[PDB]
Design a protein around this ligand. Sequence first.
Ligand SMILES: C#CCCCN(CC#Cc1nc2c(N)ncnc2n1[C@@H]1O[C@H](CO)[C@@H](O)[C@H]1O)C[C@H]1O[C@@H](n2cnc3c(N)ncnc32)[C@H](O)[C@@H]1O
Ligand SMILES: C#CCCCN(CC#Cc1nc2c(N)ncnc2n1[C@@H]1O[C@H](CO)[C@@H](O)[C@H]1O)C[C@H]1O[C@@H](n2cnc3c(N)ncnc32)[C@H](O)[C@@H]1O
Ligand SMILES: C#CCCCN(CC#Cc1nc2c(N)ncnc2n1[C@@H]1O[C@H](CO)[C@@H](O)[C@H]1O)C[C@H]1O[C@@H](n2cnc3c(N)ncnc32)[C@H](O)[C@@H]1O
Ligand SMILES: C#CCCCN(CC#Cc1nc2c(N)ncnc2n1[C@@H]1O[C@H](CO)[C@@H](O)[C@H]1O)C[C@H]1O[C@@H](n2cnc3c(N)ncnc32)[C@H](O)[C@@H]1O
Lengths: 261, 261, 261, 261
Amino acid sequence: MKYMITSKGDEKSDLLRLNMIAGFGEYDMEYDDVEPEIVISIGGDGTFLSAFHQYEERLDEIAFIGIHTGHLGFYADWRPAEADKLVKLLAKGEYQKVSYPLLKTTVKYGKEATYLALNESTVKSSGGPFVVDVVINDIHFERFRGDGLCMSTPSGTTAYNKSLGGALMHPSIEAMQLTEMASINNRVYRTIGSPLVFPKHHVVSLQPVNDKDFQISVDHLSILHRDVQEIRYEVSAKKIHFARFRSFPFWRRVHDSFIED
Amino acid sequence: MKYMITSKGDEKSDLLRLNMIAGFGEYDMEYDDVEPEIVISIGGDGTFLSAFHQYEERLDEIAFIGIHTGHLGFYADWRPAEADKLVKLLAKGEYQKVSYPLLKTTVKYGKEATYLALNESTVKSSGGPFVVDVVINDIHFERFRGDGLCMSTPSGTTAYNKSLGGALMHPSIEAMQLTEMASINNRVYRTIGSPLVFPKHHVVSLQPVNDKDFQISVDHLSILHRDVQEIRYEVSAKKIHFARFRSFPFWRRVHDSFIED
Amino acid sequence: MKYMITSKGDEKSDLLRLNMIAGFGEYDMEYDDVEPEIVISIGGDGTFLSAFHQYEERLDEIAFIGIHTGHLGFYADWRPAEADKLVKLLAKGEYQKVSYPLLKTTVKYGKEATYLALNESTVKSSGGPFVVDVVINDIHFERFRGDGLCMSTPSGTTAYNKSLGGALMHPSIEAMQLTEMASINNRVYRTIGSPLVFPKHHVVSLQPVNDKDFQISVDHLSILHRDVQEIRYEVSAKKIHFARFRSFPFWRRVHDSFIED
Amino acid sequence: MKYMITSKGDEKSDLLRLNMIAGFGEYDMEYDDVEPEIVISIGGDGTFLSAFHQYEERLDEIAFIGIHTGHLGFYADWRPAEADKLVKLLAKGEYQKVSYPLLKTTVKYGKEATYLALNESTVKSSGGPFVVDVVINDIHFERFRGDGLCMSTPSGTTAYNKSLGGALMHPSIEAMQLTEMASINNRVYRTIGSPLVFPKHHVVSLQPVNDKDFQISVDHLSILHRDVQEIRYEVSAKKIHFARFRSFPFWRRVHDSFIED
Ligand SMILES: C#CCCCN(CC#Cc1nc2c(N)ncnc2n1[C@@H]1O[C@H](CO)[C@@H](O)[C@H]1O)C[C@H]1O[C@@H](n2cnc3c(N)ncnc32)[C@H](O)[C@@H]1O
Ligand SMILES: C#CCCCN(CC#Cc1nc2c(N)ncnc2n1[C@@H]1O[C@H](CO)[C@@H](O)[C@H]1O)C[C@H]1O[C@@H](n2cnc3c(N)ncnc32)[C@H](O)[C@@H]1O
Ligand SMILES: C#CCCCN(CC#Cc1nc2c(N)ncnc2n1[C@@H]1O[C@H](CO)[C@@H](O)[C@H]1O)C[C@H]1O[C@@H](n2cnc3c(N)ncnc32)[C@H](O)[C@@H]1O
Ligand SMILES: C#CCCCN(CC#Cc1nc2c(N)ncnc2n1[C@@H]1O[C@H](CO)[C@@H](O)[C@H]1O)C[C@H]1O[C@@H](n2cnc3c(N)ncnc32)[C@H](O)[C@@H]1O
């Protein structure tokens, strides 16, 4: 079927891509970066994140594969030595697909713009003070004053969420996790402090208090948004599909990345 | 139907219990502490935890209610003023039931003994050094050296899990969360540090290295177990059922207990 | 002697200032905002921080007083009701002075600019990735990748340092404390994680790796500095002097601000 | 002069000790384990901690040396290969001494018993609930409910204090640091949470509320104390003296032990 390959750009990934294309030329596999059914990312987790957002509007018709030319990634969990074994099994097909939940972010103006995140979405202050009211399912939960907030997907919990003290969540759990960035807690201000894990259909809303200008990041893309009235977080109805060929469990991936390999 | 009421023992809870029994005498509600279908706990979360373990073998035939005579609890979320409104709606029936996940703990010897936890189960050292190998689904994940480990239910995440840095999980999520107690991390020893959230059917196993004697707590019951070869944690197939009469969402319960009421 | 008074600008602080000036007119106390020997700050800790930096070049010839018109501050620890008792004892003199350590920050270019901080100095990334080599007394200690670093004075440990997990230090200790902001820790990157407390004459140096542009804050003043080759932190030889009239210990100030008053 | 050597007991340390004694026999150095002026510890930090408490009543007349036969320690910072270079310079003398602060613990009954700690002293509950009132310089600061409290020396901050989130303190600072163990924080109970660093002459007192029985550890020695009315912590007037032969700075020792060597 149709396939494409993204590269980190260095010599190692660029030439691994040209070799896989050549091996794909020995099967009925046509290169198409417009309507691919298989997207192969060669590089790191950042290169994989770029590939996800490249084809975020065809998520249901695409299976993703990650090849790490440097260290082991959580999305790029295939070694370069397995590339030739990869093209053969990609060609035959009959592979299984695994799906991970995604995070939907809605940003309102005084108009709405929505985004999809594979790792997390964060809201941070321009430079001045960051105060936001946190509303959970139309109920005011807290008034946060600090550096920012981070809402993570399950597969994103090993990323930014982890450095903020969040828990690591197995990706079969359809949930999202909110973490704080340097919360002020004294006589006037009071936050929960602990990370929060929300199920499906739960809507977490961030609302401004004085300043209505902040930086909003979705994965690796920080966007300054003006005249923002609301930021809505909920588990997306859409999912990312991975091409599954071997057993590499999430907890073994966590062990290899953080304990030792 | 059949019902019983447990009391914390102080004058306030003891006499609130006698008044509810009297009001129950005005309906076809018989007092039975052997085979009750409704268990009312008057006191605190500790009094509710006692009531759960009193009837842990009839969980599927019982609906629990908690009345807090002191501060607001997470299980005792009914105020004493609503007691007379409680007996009437308890009598008519037609109420809804909500269910929270539980944690199953299996302890092996060189024989097996299993327990059910509503808050958490913890493993801690006698006094000497605590080393355990942590195995996740038959894969060795880490060698923990520290004070202990805590495996929490969703509704237990606001308890011991919270004080150990764990995340707060909505109880509709069928999961368990593992947290560390003062982990040694240097050149020799290495743990994940972050809390871990496991889905159903995932089995977390704790295995001894040198000392085979530790204290194992299940909710409020610390048991010294000897010749222990394994401690197995997984989300239980059993659930606790609450009598639902009004809307008191979990996040509002979290807000009132920790932010301010 | 010579004195001046800064105000937060609201009606409460502005009119408390005019009343203290009037009461000062009944003594041999001349108002001089050029060469004052007594600087009175009416407002909050932010108003006091502004007053410190207003007269940072005459620190050795000035005694500071803070009056909080809102909640209790750590520098503004005098209540408005004590203002008339304040002017009398300010007039007679014979008061004692207490001194708190300060933090010196040196920023080098490819030229040097130095600053004095009463709370802390932080280095953060523009928007892109933040990597800095941390050198302690000319020895490379770690390569930090994350959101930023915070170096706090003793009296600043209850501020930004506290929200980043740092320890609270009694101000009689001539030291500085470094804390991390969301450190990446995996197979490639590795930081100490724990806060670090340095004595006098110890020099902590931050050095760039790729990007040489960051935001550098000194108290409430965030400055974008370009072509930065080094940022040097050490306990300053200069000290801030407070006019001491009553006993308000630091730990009681901590208790009232964070436990409850 | 007079000297002695303690060994961990394994073959490596036992035979390194016999070789150093033989090399010492070639100088005017007499072996005396009753009144030694030089105490050499061969093993780990635990073996060094044992040697400190062996001679805690002659601290002012003794210089300590640590040799690590396993991994690098913070007190045993000499490699076994340097043992022959050690005996020569130990024999000539003319070496310098460095001193680290110690922690004094006083335990009162209804009588007083005092102890000296090189790492830390901790107070923990038997099994039941742990509540203690924390008094700082005769002022009630907080009512702690949790697992326990840890008061660390500067050189102990890389040990138990570190695993509890405490800051790492350079040993030239005459101070002590208090850290919490799993504090309960809700509507009823409230602790500072942050670690606390106290200077000299500051007295931190722990006082019971209901239960008067707890476990009190001083370094590696956990002692169950009954009928305890008070536990008093303050920086000791006594200091431990190390034989200084080379430059191995504390921060390099921290780097090698935790970052990588
Ligand atoms: C410029 C620029 C940004 C580089 C591009 N960058 C791609 C990625 C990634 C990634 N994804 C995962 C994952 N799912 N699980 C585990 N590790 C993961 N990483 C690793 O993450 C490191 C930094 O990139 C790399 O080793 C990479 O293998 C963006 C991602 O960076 C993460 N992030 C941002 N700030 C912080 C912070 N203070 N602390 C921790 N993580 C942070 C945010 O998550 C943001 O989606
Ligand atoms: C003696 C004795 C034990 C008293 C009986 N105790 C009953 C309970 C409870 C409870 N359950 C919940 C819940 N589900 N959510 C939120 N708060 C909850 N609490 C509150 O918890 C406080 C202490 O009891 C009380 O305010 C109570 O309203 C047992 C429970 O105590 C918890 N626990 C034990 N050690 C710690 C610790 N270091 N830090 C934090 N929590 C701890 C363990 O969880 C253990 O299941
Ligand atoms: C716009 C704008 C900034 C407002 C002006 N702001 C003046 C002050 C102050 C102050 N000084 C102390 C002190 N010494 N001890 C204890 N509380 C103290 N505060 C309290 O601090 C709160 C925020 O201002 C107020 O309640 C105030 O009573 C600057 C100071 O803010 C602190 N800071 C900045 N970001 C964070 C953060 N994420 N988390 C925690 N603190 C932070 C940095 O420290 C920076 O010096
Ligand atoms: C049985 C038994 C106890 C073994 C004997 N043990 C001797 C020592 C030591 C030592 N001293 C220092 C130091 N000064 N700096 C840095 N690392 C240091 N260690 C290292 O410490 C590890 C465990 O021993 C070893 O790798 C050792 O090289 C006692 C010391 O253990 C420390 N401790 C106790 N519980 C915890 C805990 N939950 N987390 C962290 N540390 C803990 C308490 O501190 C108590 O003084």
